Write a protein that binds this ligand. Structure first.
Ligand SMILES: OC[C@H]1O[C@@H](O)[C@H](O)[C@@H](O)[C@H]1O
Ligand SMILES: OC[C@H]1O[C@@H](O)[C@H](O)[C@@H](O)[C@H]1O
Ligand SMILES: OC[C@H]1O[C@@H](O)[C@H](O)[C@@H](O)[C@H]1O
Ligand SMILES: OC[C@H]1O[C@@H](O)[C@H](O)[C@@H](O)[C@H]1O
Lengths: 141, 141
């Protein structure tokens, strides 16, 4: 039972928040489907991006921020724990100094805070996936 | 009234065939939505690609072929007739020596045949668009 994609949810983050996503690539890895997760400063999709996470399935991952409309220093990883044809579970944790990205229970990517996570007002999940689960935790002070 | 995306239709092409697509990018150009159109040799999406057309809206266009599983020589264009937030009409014509790509009635891209267009059995239209129209002409001998 699938959420609409692109998926937009208002959100707040601080140290101890987790964003958990469960989905499936729409097509085989040979065709290089993408997944993107963006942490935005406003509900508007043209707003700045505290954390940009983009998977080219089978190839690579890039992370960046978009600050006053401009992309900053791109970070690239060849790490590819995602499995061709499989549902994945992605969890993004706010640590004190960085985001930690777990794929199917394995630490795969981290990204030091360029902007306080308190700036985040919105998460968008989009590109070439079906989405069965999206959750932000809110238990912590 | 929207076709499903990814959109797959069985197709045959020869000299004089036109593929016409009407759609809209799902998000603003600042977020770099993609459009891809692939002319496949089989109904299977892992099959070879006679003509690969990929738009990064606002940025560039790449064209290529995938032959026995391997991408060949990429062709890149900075030509960007697509308008931020607008519905587009894309028509791909089979000329004797090449594909001609019209965007909103303007010749924008061409790509010389690497494989006879008669090899095409399937068209796939996918990535970050809504799709209102897909048509292959079949009037010619
Ligand atoms: O998704 C679009 C953007 O992805 C970023 O990682 C990159 O820094 C930008 O140049 C742009 O490509
Ligand atoms: O911000 C860029 C850096 O982010 C860190 O969290 C990570 O440990 C490094 O691998 C590098 O990605
Ligand atoms: O869409 C995926 C492919 O696009 C092609 O143009 C390119 O030659 C390949 O390297 C791959 O990037
Ligand atoms: O095949 C590569 C070439 O294709 C032709 O049709 C076109 O005139 C050139 O611009 C170049 O794109």
């Amino acid at each position: 039972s699938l959420l609409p994609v692109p998926y937009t949810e208002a959100a707040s983050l601080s140290t101890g928040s987790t964003v958990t996503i469960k989905g499936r690539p729409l097509v085989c890895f040979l065709n290089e489907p993408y997944l993107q997760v963006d942490f935005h400063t406003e509900m508007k999709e043209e707003s700045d991006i505290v954390f940009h996470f983009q998977v080219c399935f089978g190839r690579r991952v890039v992370m960046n921020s978009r600050e006053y409309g401009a992309w900053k220093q791109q970070v690239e990883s060849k790490n590819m724990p995602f499995q061709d044809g499989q549902e994945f579970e992605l969890s993004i944790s706010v640590l004190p100094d960085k985001y930690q990205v777990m794929v199917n229970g394995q630490s795969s990517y981290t990204f030091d805070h360029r902007i306080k996570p308190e700036a985040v007002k919105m998460v968008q999940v989009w590109r070439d996936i079906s989405l069965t689960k999206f959750n932000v935790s809110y238990l912590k002070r």
